[PDB]
């Protein structure tokens with residue numbers, strides 16, 4: 001379970017139902033709290049944008065794997081010890097967790113900076129939890145909210161009102177993926 005890179009051709013193409021997606025958000029939270037108790041340091045909880053009902057695809061793995069490398073190089077850059085790291089596939093698709101012995105805020109700012117500066121940064125959902133279980137946000141620091149993959153507006157406004165077509169979100173993912181993996 002320690003190992004972290006998810007081989008893309010072994011993707012499950014598991015079609016997740018709506019109530020299976022709604023159930024897994026509760027297992028996530030519970031799993032997140034077990035890591036915080038086993039290692040009381042901030043935790044990065046990392047999933048990939050996976051718009052459809054099939055969220056464990058070859059595309060989503062290649063994207064998850066690029067994030068793994070970048071999370072580790074960020075840890076090394078900031079001089080932050082990873083105490084535990086694991087990956088899995090859940091109802092939200094590829095998922096990773098890293099217990100990092102760092103200040104929670106620095107960690108959240110670093111991962112914000114990563115989502116912006118990295119060529120694939122907008123396919124990553126890099127959450128950061130404090131040991132108390134508080135999920136840190138851009139709003140805690142009066143930062144602009146995460147913007148939508150497809151236009152200028154905030155992600156939440158475009159996801160609430162299904163503004164953008166699912167094929168467009170997917171085609172963008174392939175497109176960003178192909179501009180990097182050149």
Ligand SMILES: [Zn+2]
Nearest residue numbers: 148150151158
């Ligand atoms: Zn939009």
